[PDB]
Amino acid sequence: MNDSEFHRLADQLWLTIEERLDDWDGDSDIDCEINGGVLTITFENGSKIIINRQEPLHQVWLATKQGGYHFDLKGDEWICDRSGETFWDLLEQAATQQAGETVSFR
């Protein structure tokens, strides 16, 4: 049921994030590491964005300089359980604010 579906969709999310930051071209230095399955993106100002799996809840969590956001699987989409906003939109907003330049995963 939900456990396999969660692993499938989260593994795809991890690869999309990693590959894009792998090919990051812009001026700002952005680094992405995977430690204990957790992704940590580090910006030149020392700020970070942290992305982890919450297995019991089948959620992906995002921790940014401004706050914490929790996402449910919704038809291949990841939706914030407090606001309805999409993961990609909230990640792009946070990364753009913390890099001081446009960061898109699209």
Site for Eu ion, rule CB under 5 A: 3, 23, 29, 31, 76
Q: Judged by CB, which is closer to Eu ion: 11, or 67?
A: 11
| C-alpha–C-alpha distance, residues 54 and 74, integer Å | 15
Q: Give least dist CB 97 to Eu ion, A.
A: 19
Measured CA to CA in angstroms, residue 27 lies from 24, 36, 47, 99 at distances of 9, 29, 17, 10
Q: Give least dist CB 62 to Eu ion, A.
A: 20
Q: Judged by CB, which is closer to Eu ion: 31, or 81?
A: 31
Specify burial of residue 94 (Cβ count, 10 A radius: 0-12, 13-18, 19+). buried
Q: Judged by CB, which is closer to Eu ion: 57, or 63?
A: 57
